[PDB]
User: Fold DNA polymerase beta from Homo sapiens.
Amino acid sequence: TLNGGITDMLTELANFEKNVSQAIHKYNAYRKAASVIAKYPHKIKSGAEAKKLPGVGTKIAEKIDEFLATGKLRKLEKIRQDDTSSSINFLTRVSGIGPSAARKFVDEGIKTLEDLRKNEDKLNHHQRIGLKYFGDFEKRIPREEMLQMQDIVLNEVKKVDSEYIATVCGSFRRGAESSGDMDVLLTHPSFTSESTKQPKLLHQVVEQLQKVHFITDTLSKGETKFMGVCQLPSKNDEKEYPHRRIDIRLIPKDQYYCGVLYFTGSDIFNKNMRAHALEKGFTINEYTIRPLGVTGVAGEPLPVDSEKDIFDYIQWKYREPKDRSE
DNA sequence: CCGACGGCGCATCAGC
DNA sequence: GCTGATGCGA
DNA sequence: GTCGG
Ligand code: NA
Ligand code: NA
Assistant:
């Protein structure tokens, strides 16, 4: 909160770059800047002070000086009042509506949730669902609800086939007090990188979850990845729980733990391990870990049967997810 | 100066 | 109808 | 917008 005004500012500039100007790299540049500054244990007094932080350049430094001297940014103030831009930016909060769709909608007069509600025929399946649960999707999930959600998922998966292995990752696995959604990694001994991928291993799990009315909607669904909506059962006379976003990924047995490691995060922790992995002759990614030859040629992936194995390779002591903040 | 900046599954579109 | 490109979310 | 080869 030391520089909340500054980080809020950069984050707002960030969204407009992505959603309105469609300049994704500028979006990430602003986010990077907002992040480094968010971790700075001091109240910034000038643009030059912040410029020393990695990610803050001349332009953001110039903007910080303006904000400190006036308490605002003229360019930001302007875009905020712009009917077209503020509307485009806003519409992207609807899942399924990206920068392009937001732009086309505003071009034809569709600027608010109400406008969207009156134009269902112009919305695809995903977008209709994003609109339907607009409010719910923006709410966070208390860990206690995640536990109840995990209980259902683990139970139903085992019910389908006790040989399935399912792991709820994300900040939740690291012990987060709340979550934005639920990410489930699924695998089965019968499915490996070079074997049959039976088009129903994932389907049977999604089907069972719908049968017990846990999964309520489907955004997308293929043979390896499902993205949908779910909701805990409500108690009599009890305010119903909000709908939640849940993804379920089927990964080959041999790439499962590389998957759990990666989707467990955090993002910052992954980069460090990737760096360390490199400075050890190994290359780690979402799927595997491979040795790097002398001339930089990657060798075939190394056998992995646990998160620990990955650590063993890069000479690192296994770390509990609760400590993988970075 | 000027290219990199993350990458892939799925839904849907463009081009044939 | 088929194939590759694009939008989207993660 | 920022970095760096
Ligand atoms: Na800097
Ligand atoms: Na969106």
Notes: Chain A has 16 helices and nine strands. The longest helix of chain A spans residues 143-160. Residues 97 and 321 of chain A are 33 Å apart (CA to CA).
